[PDB]
Design a protein around this ligand. Structure first.
Ligand SMILES: Cc1cc(C)n(-c2ncc(Cl)c(Nc3ccc4c(c3)CC(=O)N4)n2)n1
Ligand SMILES: Cc1cc(C)n(-c2ncc(Cl)c(Nc3ccc4c(c3)CC(=O)N4)n2)n1
Lengths: 122, 122
């Protein structure tokens, strides 16, 4: 059968984060109140139920700008976008509520579950 | 410090392969003689020294069609494209030479090294 490369997926994600850092082939800007964040739609869809539901629809597939809900905390979004590209989630007592509320809105079930475990273990 | 999600990178790659299977946001067609393969440029760049060198150049960044070297075996390319999206490499005695020659051309150093180990262990 097939040879499994145990570090390939992480190596791919690291290189996709390098492309995001250099703004290479980013195709969308996410507006979160006064802040803006560029990303790859494919990565957003891969991590979020919300972005999946948006860009999978042929009507919204080619949008270059997504205006998020004005109540969404930009810091919460920033932390989650970095999570999407790194597999690392920066949860603190100062940000737990903002991050969890953002993850619920973005429909990132695994992150929501982790936020629940963080509260439980606090 | 940050919470590490050990399965996140693999979950992202699986979802990117699902998008490729549905032709969602694929932005390039790779022509390999009589065969054609659609892909996401970001994933190709993330896995291959060749595609990285091509699309990182502003002159070639927006190409929608890449005509590979006519001597490249389409089966070899097909196997490697599936590798890029799955972390699984299908090496057999019948394909080892074709896969290794393709990986060398695509500048996929880790795959070339694995092909060398396959020959060594044969
Ligand atoms: C069989 C099958 C079913 C689905 C929904 N697939 C799927 N394909 C492709 C992508 Cl990009 C994707 N994204 C995605 C959707 C929803 C959610 C997340 C990511 C994280 C989360 O919490 N919810 N999901 N594949
Ligand atoms: C610091 C630093 C240096 C580089 C070259 N970085 C980098 N950033 C982004 C991408 Cl997409 C990328 N791809 C890539 C390039 C070459 C090769 C492979 C993938 C596989 C292989 O065998 N060779 N490489 N980052």
């Amino acid at each position: 059968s097939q040879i499994q490369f145990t570090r390939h997926a992480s190596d791919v994600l690291l290189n996709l984060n390098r492309l995001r850092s250099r703004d290479i082939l980013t195709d969308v800007v996410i507006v979160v109140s006064r802040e803006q964040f560029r990303a790859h739609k494919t990565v957003l869809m891969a991590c979020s139920g919300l972005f999946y539901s948006i860009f999978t629809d042929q009507l919204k597939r080619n949008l270059s700008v997504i205006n998020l809900d004005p109540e969404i905390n930009p810091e919460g979004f920033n932390i989650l976008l970095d999570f999407m590209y790194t597999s690392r989630l920066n949860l603190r007592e100062g940000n737990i509520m903002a991050v969890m509320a953002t993850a619920m809105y973005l429909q990132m079930e695994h992150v929501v579950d982790t936020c629940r475990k963080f509260i439980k273990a606090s």
